[PDB]
């Protein structure tokens, strides 16, 4: 249930959710390392 | 006013978002048991023709 | 004086005949019991040991007794091939339906033969042009090819083979063969009908089609073989005559589902889903007959049923290894309003191919199979969130797939009763231009309506000013 | 003991008898046990004869006598079955005595190939708005009734044999539609309750009903629609027409899966055998219209089938809908809203139909089934002011598709209806008045332009003269 | 005499019952009188259930059948090459008696632990996607699985072409000979492809073993494992063949047919208990042979056909586990029109760079996770934002190196073709060209690398190595190029 | 129950929990008699097993059985065959809801999804 | 193994690949045994059959046995009778996922679905116990997390929120390693990290420590060191 939308688990299971999800993050957390 | 805009909008939004959910959850609840039923079926089916045999 | 058995066991298809005498019938052939009616043909399936071997009849075995007489013919069930078969009605045993006489062949052939071997193999690539958009475009069909149109129950097959023959089989200049399996009476009657009001069919001068029927009211028996007698006429006119045969059938799956009926009576142990072990190879033994010759060529179009709506269900799954081209027809664009229900995705040919229909129409074939497919994927967020939150560029995309969907459909001339809108016949290189076109972007002001149920891209135009009226 | 006319039980068990015997029994023959119940010599081989039992296994016992009929499993047919209650064999159970029969007709006949038919063209009227305008049947037609549990399935069929009572009464015998109602695994009360019903409306009497209910053995409920068939095919047969309901086939395929089942054969998708399709095709195929060398008769088949939360991907929805002639889908969701006949427009079709509507009915509802399709796509995404007026009507023309059980309407009251609908002159009531408004409308012109309804009626068309004239009378109305 | 022959009990669906035979071996070879062949599978007491390798209209009730003596084989060799034969080795192109050099079993003993040595020579598909991405060596298993009409033949196909390079020379040690096995397919399906063999001029190193869609099951069953034992002549030899299985999921198929026709109690989905060990044991006789035992080689290519991309199915499964990874082709990436189709973060090589010209493995560094870098920023794009110009760099380069990667069908690259093109692209030299002219640019700098720095191709070619002299000297003819 | 009817002519209720559990019991006998399984693994006999049942409670002339049954719904699936086949018997439904008795009302029915076919 | 163990006293270690071949090879001769099949294809004496082989391996009085089985699970479902039952015959599992590895974090652990009886305070000390319970309930919460920014993005995330998904996501990288038997594929030469610095180096960055040393420092490679190395070599 935790994750069930959002955590990506295999390749062939995506949903656009799971790929917008890691998506919005990755950007996240490029834009604070960035900084730092 | 912008901003009283947008968060009507997006109440406006969310109260879809979560409604279509809702029926989404229905077809995948119908759809779900029609599998069920298959793969008992199925599963069984195997059963008997190897006892059969 | 022939060689006679009497019948031991009788359990729906399958009578089990013993002989008496030391010779027994080849696995093959056909026997016959005399009725008051005429003859109950049986198919020799297999020898069950002690002089006994178990039949399949060719018409019901209601009212047979144990010990009843049975005769052996020699040979396989056989029917009358050649031009005297053009513009009659025929069915699983070579019998005239149509009470119009015997058909005065020269020569009659059994329904079992070899198919074509390694050697006698003619292979080509020559594109068969339909008049409709979906398949001109994305899925070419071929010509002496084998061609399937894969459907549910009520999306469209007989629709869609009755639009092929209506745009194809008038200037084919060969002969064409049809055969009903399994299917509705009537819709042999409606086609008896409309052949003899195209000239097709011509009761009083020359006839270009031969019609074959075994449909759902026949007992398994007859609805398993009878596609091998529609087979073994257009055979006939592909090697002795060297003729350019069109086979259309409706529905081969039903050849399967016979099959499937006796499978358990004549012993098999039963495979996936209940059907015979025999699936592929009886499969095999049939539609590689359906194949195009040194001596002659066919193209052959068949209706392929899908049990419930599953594609992986072994009749239709073991189909498509036989085909050059797939029409896959979806329940789900039938509901949308959307015909023919082709599934862009989904149905193939082995002829969507630059060097074949030339770099332009590949190009534009991939770009609107690009863009179909950037929709679907995006079907998720759509259907939750709203259109809404999308990019801009994904928005684009999304209505210019709209419009291509729409785009995609086309009025049938067979279909004028269920649209009430004339038939539509587009030739491929307008079809290749007008989607080239909306590609490019050069209509993207026109809305979604004009595109649906129309012809060439002159007839969006046309609907758009109408609409703007 | 005369071992080639009869036999001695084996062993019974799960519905089956082997018996020792019956040398010269014919395959599909029937049987009778020492008990006086009936079975079916479904396998012949050698030593033993394999029985079905149409009843109880208590009912036979191993080492009890078995004899021969003689017949193929038949059935008495004929008019003097006209207002009677029989089983699947054909016994009466009505309690008013021995069938005046006609004949015998066995239980299994081919259905009539291509050249005994004609394609059909006559109107089986429904009475029911929504269906005669939307989904029209013609004789020799098959038109699936299809949705789930409570859809009002059951009541479509029942309307429309109660409107047979409009020809069935006169002296036009062409015009006349024999009723056959086969309850197929109901409940025995609710039968008898329907029987009731139509004695009540005087539809008895050109109603046969043939019943083989949930406590009879499956048997009887797998017969009873073919021994039904043979029963309409008298009338089809004899220059007649006939109507039969089959209610309902998914329980006859659940009857039919029993015995398959039981005598081992391998179960396929969802357990049912390979030739369930068949048990239906061969069926339903025997429903037909005939050309006028074999007397023009007709046997139209309204079979039902009962969907599980919708599904008509399953099966059998699928293998009926692949024999029949159209769908009308009956949804709950339509239902529940009070949307009733709850036909969903969109996926209700009918083949054959429009050659069959009346003429009159065709002219005054152009666009009405389209529209209403869109109009539900509308409603559904739903302040665009296009898209409010499609709206309007789309909600008075809905409203005005509703309709009581049991209460199916003459052609000549439903165009008047249909008429001032799809041209407008509704736009301006209010919704809960439409039903007001129909009553009053129809008192009106039954009152004041009954030379109006009486051509509707009688030349089943309208002329630009009698369309304006209906015209005048609609504005007319819609001021008061 | 009932030690050596026997009588037909009963006979239908391709199986015949019989008496007798009593000295028969398990598997042996039979003759009928009629003149069809069969395979003796079950020894019973009173009883032998024999398959048939042809139709049973001719075979009846007491007809008399004879011992070979024979385990059933086929016949191997190099005078195969440039034949078309059936499961048996029967001819079928129509050109006389097959040219054998000897007989062997259908079913053989794959190589144990100590006759191999580890996979380190190349088989050069030609494909720029597979030779950078899965590279394949001699002596592995690489599996090709997917939808219907996904590319999968064609793959197969491209790498048989491909091997007319070093087949055509006169060194033994790079010659790579073909073995088609095609099971199941149509008749007019392998006409065709041997059509386009003889086109290319490949059918003289290719053999080509066919159980086609009506022919009895038990000759699609058979046909890759005889087709192994022909493939295996040249790995015992000190050769090197390349074995393509096309496909197994129909062989399985064949295996369950005959196997409920012998009445054995099937298991899952009525495939036989040993559906796997089918696979398993056909596949392990693909090896890399030592030193000692010749240092020949078979690699083999199975194909598995998928339905609506289910790899977790029963059959696909059963393979992926076996093969040494697999090349995944998907309907999606199929229709938009990249081909091959292949699924990059999907498909593995669990041999790797081992298996690779080195001169490819230097120029392909990180090419594999630079589209894992790629596919990463892909999201990033519908996710409608305009940040990260680091990010363009990449975003940018990923668009134009998988454009480089498409390629079309029967058109194979030698190595020194390939690799001037992937360094193009992993460096950059790309990101400041149109996307609608990489197609033309490949064909372009090809023909300027022909014209003008023909020994710069010469050297990769002969070397199979980039000295940081040649690195530098590749680098300078880009750069100078990139300025048309 | 039938007895009360057919001697003493009364209109007797009888009660039985949970209906399911006489459809589980004929689904296990079924099994043990080597009866090949049905759909989900019920009786072949599904249907007819639960007729022989449920005709007999009827009205008669002398009086009548009425009956009230518990209802066990498997998987919350109204779709599986054992509540499938039951409900084609039901003449009505009495849906006791924890949503509503939380709210303090008894009997705790919900007026809206309990049904009758007699509401005519 | 078993002959080390008994008459030799010895400390016996036992490598299997791949276990499910054991139950597998049952499974295809099962049928002409003549048994009647059990649920997905295996045959009914799975559990006993595998009882009989996994009761042997253990440790007793005369000495010690520790083996290491790869268990196969097919088409990737745990739920497969053959790996099910395997699960209560093992004291420790490392249970792999598809899902991990294509992220690029090899070993493909996956870090809450492995267990091990000796997870225990008692066993590894308390502060050991501290760090992987607090390990696991932060990549636990990112989970829950991952849903809402599916959802809803990143503005309806705590200043808190924010921390827990930057530290888990190092925490998750830190947990990937450079195989030795594994350099042909990394290309990385291989790391072998003693236990202490393992818990050390965790404890430390569940504290905060290095909340300001970005991700790719703490992926595919060793202790907290080379952590710090790879964090300043990116810098140039
Ligand atoms: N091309 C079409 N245009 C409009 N309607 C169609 C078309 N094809 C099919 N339909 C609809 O589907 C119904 C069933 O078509 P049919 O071809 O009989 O389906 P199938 O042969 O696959 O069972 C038709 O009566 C019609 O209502
Ligand atoms: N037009 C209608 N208006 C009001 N009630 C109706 C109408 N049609 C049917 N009903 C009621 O709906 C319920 C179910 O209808 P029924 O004919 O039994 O459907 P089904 O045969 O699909 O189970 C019955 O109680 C019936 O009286
Ligand atoms: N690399 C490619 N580029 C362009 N077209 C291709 C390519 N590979 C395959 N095709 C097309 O796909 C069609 C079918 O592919 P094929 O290899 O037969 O797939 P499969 O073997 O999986 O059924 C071929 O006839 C060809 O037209
Ligand atoms: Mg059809
Ligand atoms: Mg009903
Ligand atoms: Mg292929």
């Not at chain 3, 043909?41 to 071997?53: P, S």
């Not at chain 3, 033994?285 to 599953?310: C, H, N």
């Not at chain 4, 015009?175 to 004695?199: H, I, N």
Request: glycine share 10%; net charge negative.
């Amino acid at each position: 249930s935790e994750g069930s939308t959002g955590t990506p688990r295999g390749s062939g299971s995506e949903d656009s959710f799971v790929k917008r999800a890691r998506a919005t993050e990755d950007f996240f957390v490029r834009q604070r390392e960035k900084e730092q | 006013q912008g901003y009283a805009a947008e968060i009507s909008a997006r109440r406006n939004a969310m109260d879809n978002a979560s409604k279509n959910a809702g029926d989404m959850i229905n077809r995948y609840s119908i759809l779900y048991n029609r599998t069920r039923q298959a793969v008992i079926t199925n599963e069984l089916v195997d059963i008997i023709t190897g006892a059969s045999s | 004086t022939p060689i006679t058995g009497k019948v031991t066991a009788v359990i729906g298809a399958i009578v089990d005949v013993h002989f008496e005498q030391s010779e027994l019938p080849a696995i093959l052939n056909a026997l016959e019991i005399k009725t008051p009616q005429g003859k109950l043909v049986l198919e020799v399936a297999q020898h069950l040991g002690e002089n006994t071997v178990r039949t399949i009849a060719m018409d019901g075995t209601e009212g047979l007794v144990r010990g009843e007489k049975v005769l052996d013919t020699g040979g396989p069930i056989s029917v009358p091939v050649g031009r005297e078969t053009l513009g009659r009605i025929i069915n699983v045993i070579g019998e005239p339906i149509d009470e119009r006489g015997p058909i005065k062949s020269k020569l009659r052939k059994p329904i079992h033969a070899d198919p074509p071997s390694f050697a006698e193999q003619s292979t080509s690539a020559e594109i068969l042009e339909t008049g409709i958009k979906v398949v001109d475009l994305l899925a070419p069909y071929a010509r002496g090819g084998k061609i399937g149109l894969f459907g549910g129950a009520g999306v469209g097959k007989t629709v869609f083979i009755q639009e092929l023959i209506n745009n194809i089989a008038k200037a084919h200049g060969g002969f064409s063969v049809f055969t009903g399996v399994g299917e509705r009476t009537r819709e042999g009657n409606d086609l008896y009908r409309e052949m003899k009001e195209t000239g097709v069919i011509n009761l009083e001068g020359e006839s270009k089609v031969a019609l074959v029927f075994g449909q759902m009211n026949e007992p398994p028996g007859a609805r398993a073989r009878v596609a091998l007698t529609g087979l073994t006429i257009a055979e006939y006119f592909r090697d002795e005559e060297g003729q350019d045969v069109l086979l259309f059938i409706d529905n081969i799956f039903r050849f399967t589902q016979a099959g499937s009926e006796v499978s358990a009576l004549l012993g098999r142990i039963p495979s996936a889903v209940g059907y015979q072990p025999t699936l592929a190879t009886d499969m095999g033994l049939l539609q590689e007959r359906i194949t195009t010759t040194k001596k002659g060529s066919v193209t052959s179009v068949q209706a392929v049923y899908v049990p419930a709506d599953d594609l992986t269900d072994p009749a239709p799954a073991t189909t498509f290894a036989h085909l050059d081209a797939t029409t896959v027809l979806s329940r789900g664009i039938s509901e949308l309003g959307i015909y023919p229900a082709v599934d862009p995705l989904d149905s193939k040919s082995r002829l969507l191919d630059a060097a074949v229909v030339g770099q332009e129409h590949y190009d534009v074939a991939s770009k609107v199979q690009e863009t179909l497919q950037t929709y679907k994927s995006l079907q998720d967020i759509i259907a939750i969130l709203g259109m809404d939150e999308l990019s801009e560029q994904d928005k684009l995309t999304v209505e210019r797939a709209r419009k291509i969907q729409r785009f995609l459909s086309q009025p049938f001339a067979v279909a004028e009763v269920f649209t009430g809108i004339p038939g539509k016949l587009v030739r491929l290189k307008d079809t290749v231009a007008s989607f080239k076109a909306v590609l490019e972007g050069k209509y993207d002001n026109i809305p979604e309506h004009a595109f649906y149920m129309v012809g060439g891209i002159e007839d969006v135009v046309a609907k758009a000013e109408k609409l703007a009226a | 003991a005369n071992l080639n006319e009869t036999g001695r039980v084996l062993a019974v068990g799960d519905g089956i008898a082997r018996v020792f015997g019956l040398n010269n029994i014919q395959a599909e023959e029937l049987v009778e046990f020492s008990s006086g119940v009936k079975g079916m010599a479904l396998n012949l081989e050698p030593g033993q004869v394999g029985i079905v039992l149409f009843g109880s296994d208590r009912l036979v016992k191993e080492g009890e006598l078995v004899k021969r009929t003689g017949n193929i499993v038949d059935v008495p047919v004929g008019p003097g079955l006209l207002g009677r209650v029989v089983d699947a064999l054909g016994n009466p159970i009505d309690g008013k005595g021995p069938i005046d029969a006609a004949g015998r007709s066995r239980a299994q006949v081919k259905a009539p190939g291509i050249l005994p038919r004609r394609s059909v063209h006559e109107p089986v009227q429904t009475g029911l708005k929504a269906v005669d305008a939307l989904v029209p049947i013609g004789r020799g037609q098959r038109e699936l009734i299809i949705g789930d549990r409570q859809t009002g399935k059951t009541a479509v069929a029942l309307d429309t044999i109660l409107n047979q009572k409009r020809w069935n009464n006169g002296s036009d015998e062409s015009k006349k539609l024999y009723c056959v109602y086969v309850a197929v695994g109901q409940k025995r009360s609710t039968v008898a309750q329907l029987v009731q019903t139509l004695e009540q409306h005087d539809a008895m009497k050109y109603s046969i009903i043939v019943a083989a209910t949930a406590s009879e053995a499956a048997p009887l409920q797998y017969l009873a629609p073919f021994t039904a068939a043979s029963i309409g095919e008298w009338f089809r047969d004899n220059g007649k027409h006939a109507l039969i309901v089959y209610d309902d086939l998914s329980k006859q395929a659940v009857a039919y899966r029993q015995l398959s089942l039981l005598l081992r054969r391998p179960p396929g998708r969802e357990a049912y055998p390979g030739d369930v399709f068949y048990l239906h095709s061969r069926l339903l195929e025997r429903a037909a219209k005939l050309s006028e060398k074999e007397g023009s008769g007709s046997l139209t088949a309204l079979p039902v089938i009962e969907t599980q939360g919708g599904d008509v991907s399953a099966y059998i929805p699928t293998n009926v809908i692949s024999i029949t002639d159209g769908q009308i889908f009956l949804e709950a969701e339509l239902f529940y809203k009070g949307i009733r006949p709850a036909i969903n427009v969109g996926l209700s079709v009918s083949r054959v139909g429009s050659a069959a509507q009346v003429k009159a009915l065709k002219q005054v509802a152009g666009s009405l089934k389209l529209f209403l399709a869109q109009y539900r796509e509308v409603a559904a995404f739903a302040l665009d002011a296009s898209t409010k007026q499609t709206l309007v009507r789309g909600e008075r023309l809905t409203q005005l598709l509703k309709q009581n059980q049991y209460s199916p309407l003459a052609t000549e009251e439903q165009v008047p209806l249909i008429y001032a609908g799809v041209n407008g002159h509704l736009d301006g009531i209010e919704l809960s008045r439409i039903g007001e408004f129909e009553s009053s409308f129809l008192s009106y012109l039954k009152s004041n332009h009954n030379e109006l309804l009486t051509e509707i009626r009688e030349k089943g068309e309208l002329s630009k003269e009698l369309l304006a004239s209906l015209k005048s009378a609609t504005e007319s109305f819609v001021a008061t």
